[PDB]
């Protein structure tokens, strides 16, 4: 009474699939499945070298089934839900299926680092992930592209896709290696592409001081949207890699147009508007250097004629020849409070320009 892998596989292979498909399994089938592997990985010569390849082939055949069931929907929404159902089941089988092969994994040589699970998590990456990866993102982004426009959706669809890019990376050195190059990369491109044809239009439609209330409000809405769809669990600077994309796409890409209005806001004393510009050009590298320069030159030329009317009139009354500059300085020492809250960079130019009136 003997037995080989050829005689016993046809009794095992059902139990593999029942576990791969997350189908219910009986207690006796668990023990039969250990007891078959105990028998093949011993009495069979190339037995362990056959459960190894048979199990590659059968895992791969299931993951090809799952890909067809996901790609069965044409609704870019029910297709996201279908991918996560099959994966969440899958990921949850990676903790179960590698157990009846405890002797295989020894005969071929605990916890996560097993050969079977590594075979399961890989084959999902070799196959269904690698093939659907670009569709997975060209669908999830449309649900946020739509979220930016009114369409309320199930925000767990793009979250579930996110935390599925986190769990499939088996790299211990870079855990976010297939999230930082796939999910994060598409969310930056779509956010970028979105504000190249939606934000240049708010500048054609409405004015500039209107666009500043817009770029502002869109850095606030793209941030609380990133603190949902992006990674916050383990620190990665992804949400902040988005705001750099956004600043560049909202504020940096229109700095000259914003800084052109600087000079007149000073003259007309528009402090609520200079504070808004400040809020925007302060997220830009060296963005307020022209701003500083517009308050440094205006202070000068103002205190360059609002002082010439003295040598032709008040020259012997320093009690008046010094007070105009007690008020002049006050015109600018109070613009900075109301507008820049006495930021130390604008005091340096408030002073760099007032030394020239001396």
């Amino acid at each position: 009474g003997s037995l080989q892998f050829e005689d016993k596989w046809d009794f095992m292979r059902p139990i593999v699939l029942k576990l791969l498909r997350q189908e219910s399994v009986t207690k006796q089938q668990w023990f039969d499945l250990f007891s078959d592997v105990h028998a093949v990985c011993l009495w069979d010569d190339k037995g362990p070298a056959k459960i190894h390849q048979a199990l590659k082939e059968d895992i791969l055949e299931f993951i090809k089934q799952a890909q067809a069931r996901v790609l069965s929907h044409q609704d870019d929404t029910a297709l996201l839900k279908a991918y996560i159902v099959e994966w969440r089941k899958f990921f949850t089988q990676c903790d179960i299926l590698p157990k009846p092969f405890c002797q295989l994994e020894i005969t071929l040589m605990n916890v996560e680092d097993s050969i079977v699970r590594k075979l399961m998590l890989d084959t999902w990456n070799e196959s269904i992930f690698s093939n659907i990866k670009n569709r997975l993102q060209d669908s999830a982004m449309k649900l946020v592209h739509a979220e930016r426009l009114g369409e309320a959706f199930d925000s767990q669809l793009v979250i579930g896709v996110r935390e599925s890019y986190v769990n499939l990376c088996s790299n211990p050195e870079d855990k976010l290696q297939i999230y930082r190059d796939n999910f994060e990369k598409a969310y930056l491109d779509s956010t970028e592409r979105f504000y190249r044809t939606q934000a240049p239009s708010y500048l054609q439609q409405n004015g500039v001081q209107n666009y500043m209330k817009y770029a502002d409000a869109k850095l606030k809405e793209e941030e609380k949207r990133a603190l949902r769809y992006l990674e916050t669990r383990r620190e990665c600077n992804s949400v902040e890699a988005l705001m750099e994309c956004c600043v560049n796409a909202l504020v940096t890409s229109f700095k000259e147009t914003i800084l052109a209005e600087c000079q007149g806001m000073i003259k007309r004393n528009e402090t609520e508007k200079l504070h808004l510009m400040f809020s925007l050009m302060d997220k830009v590298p060296n963005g307020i250097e022209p701003m500083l320069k517009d308050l440094e030159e205006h202070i000068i030329s103002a205190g360059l004629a609002d002082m010439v009317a003295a040598a032709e009139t008040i020259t012997t009354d320093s009690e008046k020849y010094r007070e105009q500059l007690d008020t002049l300085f006050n015109r600018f020492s109070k613009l900075v409070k109301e507008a820049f809250q006495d930021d130390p960079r604008f005091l340096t130019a408030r002073d760099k320009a007032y030394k020239a009136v001396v």
Partner: peptide, 15 residues
């Protein structure tokens, strides 16, 4: 033999 217990051990912690 004792593999019945390693199977019985795996059935419990998994289910």
């Amino acid at each position: 033999p004792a593999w019945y217990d390693c199977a019985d051990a795996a059935w419990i912690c998994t289910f």
